[PDB]
Symmetry: C5
């Protein structure tokens, strides 16, 4: 039983994020728990303040015609309990629900440990015989407590795209809004726990430049290469199969190289030190002790710049 | 209260994928969230446009007779909220729901990291005393937004098998349709993270051809063999118990060999270098330095061709 | 409001497996999704074909008296949607539902990787003041599509025990039926991934029979023993705490031995080669190179026979 | 509408375990699926056998006043379907439901692999204006089929504490009963898979007493220490964070010691054999070959006795 | 149909924790199962004790006006069954439900293994045309049995913030309460299983100060570094991505250092003992045998103090 309008009925929206949590990098989802604030003029039930009752008259959902406001990017049906419905004199309705649903917004892992994200919530609404345009009411969109959690992420701002995008979808126009949750990552636990430990093993790796014992040079370069796999695998697990290249995926892989040429050197410092030409060997070994850390720190400036600086 | 027909009542179907996600290779399932569009002539409620009401008349599901359209390959009951029902003059009904259910479609891991898949959604419908044939309406089957996600997979096309397959199941004919979601994998994160690291350790493995120290040769070939298990196990975990052989399961196992004969060589380069016959030893060792990488790259062309090229 | 009988009312059952999946070895359960077909004479609503209506008259569950058919070995309440109810003239009722519930049937892991299983579904029914006997109608028990999945298992046959087992349970006789799902395992992925890799490490283990370097013999026998734990642990995890002995649990453990006496030998080949008695040492070492693989392959014939052959 | 009594109305209880399963040591819970048998005199609906109807009259739950019998230690609401209600002449009611709920009973891991447990189910009932005392009827408490499963546990007995415990909880007396499920563990798969493998590695550990090569002694004692972690971690995972000490937690940790002093010895057998005092070294090494296994087997009798014997 | 008041209607709250469990450090949540006790004066249904019925009159929820009391920090809708409603003469209502919901309270891992926590449950309530203030009734808040479980945590006290916090949220004041669950961890299983084993490997690490064999010194310091990753990874897994530094994350990382300079020393004890200057080498090595354990135990006092002592 929809509201007999004279033009496209505007529905007024708003989201008050109450709780954020379980942002799942692998799955590219996250769970939210918020208020949904809707409103519209249904002149059809305006109501003579003086003549009867009081200021505003409370209805149960069955009584009034309510607009179906579906969330677009949601795993299952949104999970909402209705909080209050308050029809104004002029026929204006004040709806408030408190849904919670896991939302499917994508993430850009291009700078992985040091990335910022922009999550989305959508809200479509389909037309019947009056057209429905949705739009935001910013006093119910200040939505975000001063307690919005979302572990391991700094929450920058909850805003929304005022202008809706109105489609024609299957011979019936819909109207979609864009609610934006912007967050930077709390990179850090990534250093004492990944970045640093990863570097340390790389350095030990090439302690075998000041060494001549092949036995203790392979026991050297090789033992550490293993440990680095232990970190490549640790990192690769809390992170999805990107079709592009991560930052840490870069350096973690560039690392795989300074373990090859490292093992190349120690290997050649020997089919060159049994070839009774230690003239050359400890020439190269002497040299690696510079080329390596330099070319590294150099390619890390080259690499890092290639990602952040551009 | 079914629609008094004169022949098999055609029901017209359609699916607009709104969201795709949680494709689970182990479980061989995936979750979808779409529109379901149905329609049929129930002349029994045609309705004199002029004589009353308006262009089209809205019903609640309880009022009209609606066809039970069950999804075949679904874990639990599909999870659908009804979006609109609009009966036309002639008695034509326009139904639209927005279900979300995890679907059980199988996958072919024969090319694992480089595989393409064809997921299915089914839709049966059982007959009563008028027969029901289902069939697709392609304006509600263009189903797939321009945002269909499905992480780590490229989505190629959402189509469907126009011709239904009508069974006789328990003295009552059913009619089933086939909705096809075709996707290729985003192989890649499989290289910097599996393929390459896996290769590197294999190479270092057989650096012990330019070496004579047994101690540093087993410390050599053996250390890396371990690391390779660390990758065989990593890979074997995000992948189900196929009764056939995966591609990466092949090469990952062919790899287990070039670690055995590698260990064979270093082992014989010694019961042959203590047998005061280093004549022979550093003949073999010298040789392995070719046989190995060749036979490998050879068996990789042999292997790769055996999977992709045929 | 039960059917006024003259003797024990027979209820006629039937299950059409539509989907099988999530067989969980650890949990000893599995999920099924099937049809449930029931039928009985309730003469009390026989209905004068000519005098009124038509051939068969459709009821909603609230209208008719229906027998409670509970599933015995089920985790929670069975999860069923009712598909059709069709009362015949004589008063015969035709009921059909489409339940899905995870079933708790036990498994016998005595031959683990090479085992066949017989899963059960039960169906009791309690009496009131007429006795209820259940029994099977085999045209609705041909239940099993030609698509019954159940990953990593070959499905041999869906049958059922015609004769019911009628208990007296708490001063009211019940009647239980036995629906049997027989499946063999797809042992195989167990070879390239467990059996073979497990053997290979055992072999390398005792390459240290053709060796004299204690350093590279412990680096030898010992490194492999580790790797075998890596497999004992892998296997032990996808498998419950049996009070009996698995097959692979046997050989996996018999393996632990050929790594002890292996380590025993290498160890004695030395407190006997420093005891300036290499007379004896390279007598034993020479010998082990036979005793071991023989006694193994011998005890594997002895073991294998002990499980399968008996 | 409760039963007008003259004193505390006795409600008669009973539980027929139909199915047991998913005992979860980590979570300290388990799932059961049983019958619940209740009964009480509601003289208020006694009913003139001859004057009307028959021997006993069947009611739907809505018709009669039924006592709320909540289970105390249950995760969520118990999940029950009602099986039959049969009011006797005198006004006696016969109630039977078939619930299934996961129960939260605690476990005592003090003897871990060799422990026996006593699981509980509770049943309270709150009073209104007549007091409710619950009590057991032992013909509906013989509850336990001859098929009660519960994998990896031997089921010893299903009994119950006849005398209820009546509390005063919030100005209204409740009455609670105690249903006892006693089970011993099927320790065993713990030997071929944990105990034995764990010992074997410990023994090889100290094969390095009959050795002099430091390289092969660290490669010896150390390699095995790792493997033992692989077991400590395996065990620690299928077992919760006890505030007390497990049995296997003891020996698994006492083991950590015989790997330290083991490594201590091999280490000192060398800063004492390079100190040109091999006089002493192979005095100690000689000695360890006894002290160790003895002190172990000694501390294992000391330890084992400390747990089981007391 | 709300209670015609003369001022802000006070609603009187109370929570009796019946069960605690599944505290999930990763997810920062936990499940509770408690009583919820509400009460308020609805003079509108006061009821002439003598004139009719009895002392107190029982209602079903549909009959009375009940306040919506939503829990704030909850994943999904709270899961509550209603236990009793008892309206007093004066019009006072006595409500009791038994909900169970997983709650989202944050945790402070700054002292990880030795941390104490303060979990929250919230309860808001929105106003309509009479204002709603909530407040606690402490005889129904003594909520916590003498069996409150919560594995691996010592439960210190269940209390609540008497004074509510009244917001203005979207043109309608709400009122929120704070129920506090305080718990210390059962650190301990963290010692025999993490702390101690972690230390032991560190010590063995630097046994290679009383050694001169580079081969057995890298086989020494390096083997253990690996094992330490095995612990860093074990610990890092049962713990979320803190933006701050854990205690065990500190020492676990400070440990990474005493493995670097350890490896630095053994490495320099050699490009200095081949440089025919063993004058210096076994000067340094001699020294490390003190500097290390001291600087450690020193930096552990420095570190530990930095977390607990401040
Ligand atoms: As090693």
């Amino acid at each position: 039983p929809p509201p007999i309008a004279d033009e496209p009925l505007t529905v007024n929206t708003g989201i008050y994020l109450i709780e954020c949590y379980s942002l799942d990098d692998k799955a590219e989802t996250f769970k939210v728990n918020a208020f949904l604030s809707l409103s519209w003029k249904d002149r059809r039930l305006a109501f003579d303040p003086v003549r009867s009752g009081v200021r505003v008259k409370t209805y149960e959902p069955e009584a009034i015609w309510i607009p179906e406001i579906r969330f677009v990017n949601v795993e299952n049906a949104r999970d909402a309990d209705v909080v209050d419905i308050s029809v104004s004199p002029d026929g204006t309705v004040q709806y408030l629900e408190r849904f919670s649903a896991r939302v499917l917004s994508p993430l850009d892992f291009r700078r992985y440990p040091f990335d910022s994200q922009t999550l989305h919530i959508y809200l479509i609404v389909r037309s019947v015989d009056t057209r429905n345009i949705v739009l935001a009411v910013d006093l119910e969109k200040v939505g975000k407590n001063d307690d919005v959690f979302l572990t391991g992420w700094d929450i920058e701002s909850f805003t929304a795209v005022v202008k809706p995008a109105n489609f024609a979808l299957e011979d019936r126009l819909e109207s979609k809004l864009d609610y934006q949750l912007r967050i930077s990552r709390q990179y850090f636990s990534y250093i004492p726990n990944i970045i640093l430990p990863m570097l340390f093993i790389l350095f030990i790796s090439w302690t075998a430049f000041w060494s001549t014992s092949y036995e203790a040079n392979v026991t050297l370069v090789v033992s550490t290469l293993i440990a680095h796999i232990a970190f490549n695998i640790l990192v690769e697990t809390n992170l999805p199969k990107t079709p592009y290249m991560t930052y840490t995926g870069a350096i973690i892989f560039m690392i795989y190289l300074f373990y090859f040429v490292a093992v190349i050197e120690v290997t050649v410092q020997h089919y060159l030190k049994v070839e009774s030409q230690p003239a050359r060997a400890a020439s190269i070994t002497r040299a690696s002790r510079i080329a390596f850390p330099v070319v590294f720190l150099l390619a890390n400036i080259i690499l890092a710049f290639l990602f952040f600086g551009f």
